[PDB]
Subunit: 306 residues, 2 copies
Amino acid sequence: SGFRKMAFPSGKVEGCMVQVTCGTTTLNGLWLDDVVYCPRHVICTSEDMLNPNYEDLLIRKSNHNFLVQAGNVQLRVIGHSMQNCVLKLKVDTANPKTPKYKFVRIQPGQTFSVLACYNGSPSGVYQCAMRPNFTIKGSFLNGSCGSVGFNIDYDCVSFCYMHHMELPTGVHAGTDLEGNFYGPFVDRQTAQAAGTDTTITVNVLAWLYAAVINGDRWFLNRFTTTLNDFNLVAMKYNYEPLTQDHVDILGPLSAQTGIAVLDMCASLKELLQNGMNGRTILGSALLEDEFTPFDVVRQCSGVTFQ
Amino acid sequence: SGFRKMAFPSGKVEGCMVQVTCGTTTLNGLWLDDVVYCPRHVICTSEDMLNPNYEDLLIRKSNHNFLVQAGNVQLRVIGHSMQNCVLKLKVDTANPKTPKYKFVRIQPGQTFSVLACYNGSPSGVYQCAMRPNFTIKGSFLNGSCGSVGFNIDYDCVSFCYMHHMELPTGVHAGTDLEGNFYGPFVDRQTAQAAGTDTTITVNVLAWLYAAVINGDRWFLNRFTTTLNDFNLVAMKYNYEPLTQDHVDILGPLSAQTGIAVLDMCASLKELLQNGMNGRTILGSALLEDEFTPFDVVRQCSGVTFQ
């Protein structure tokens, strides 16, 4: 037993991380088969980032202006292409450590592991959520650009995120591996509104089910509610509206615990209205929304990768 | 910027995990050079665990009664030895993936990464603390025994923990890699008192410094205090006494932020006495004690491994 915010084992991704240098700028790349993927802003100076013309900046770059190092190994760049906000550097060597992999664009509220890297070297791994407003709350210092987010299903790495920007508000923005930003963000050093964020209701309910399974049940109450009644409370507390699709995804946790999803909703309503009264749930004094229903089932059933 | 509970990259440890089977019992082992390390209770049935005579149980086992599988690879066991609560199985093949490594016995309040494994397969990685009472609050299901805790310093893995037991209270107990339990625990299915736990004061102060660096400064107050005055408050709230060694370890964070350690102590006193008044610090509604001063410096300065 016990419940922890757990990242995927990072070894399959560690083997793909490289350093990319273009003139004065160094950041991280992702070496898969004979292609290195990195943020296109590797071609910018500090001054360029105020208002970059990426097409004009990239035209002044040749294959030989991209230095790619895999630990000690120097890779030879034989092609370059810009796709949306990513650069694809064709190299003459297929990465011998390339795992089975897919590129996926995740939905708001989904979770993934980040391997934070500097100079192509991994520093640490943590689990987070794509916020409803398409930001992430990460730990990213100067040099972390090109660090990637991923999920693992047995032996297959699904890459969903590449780190590009810290907004002036201190939250983080990036792209899928086709270089399309999540949310309205652009790769320019400018004021950018993230927009109202909401709490991921279906995740909070999943984590309340994890709490019950682990013996934390003080918050289970006498009451039930309806989808429309609960959603009136969701609106007032800036929670995502609960849909029947969300109820259906919670079905397996409802079955295991014998607690109907709308009964767990009435428990959550009472917590939103009355607060936690100085108590904790799974070691937290607030309502946690960075576990998906799938996360809770995985952790609670000990599922494995390789 | 941003601050997250970050685990070490797990790839160097993933390459060392194996499945160990002795009759009916399967758990995890750690393959380093030509030695596999696992919990000695791999030789017990459910019934044995009530009151095992490990010396008598092990005498009935030969080399060929230990099945060791490294993914698809079957290893040949050519020796077995019991050291304290661990079994050392000599195998005929040195692990080709053996990283540079040390065995360390950590101090209460120190942190480490756990690679949770089932059937010799890694499922996830998380950071935790050795509690002052020598328990850990992990996520460990049936089959997780033999999962290991570790730190990494550049290219060297320091193994500090091997998982052995869940206490009836749902907290976790284990050994160093010489098989010596942390705390008073034994590898027997019996009622075992963990003893009063305390909060790791020096860690809470480190995390308050991380908060200030990241812009969370609402809790910084008008007051200072003394070591003896603060320790009177520490006693009342079940916090570890602060010593001058703890002050000295906090020196670099005091220097970076310009906040004297005793001034940060008076901030912490006010939080202990008045609570958080429904506010948060680095996304937490309680006082976090699973970051060491070294953890905060590492994360805040982007230090790297390989």
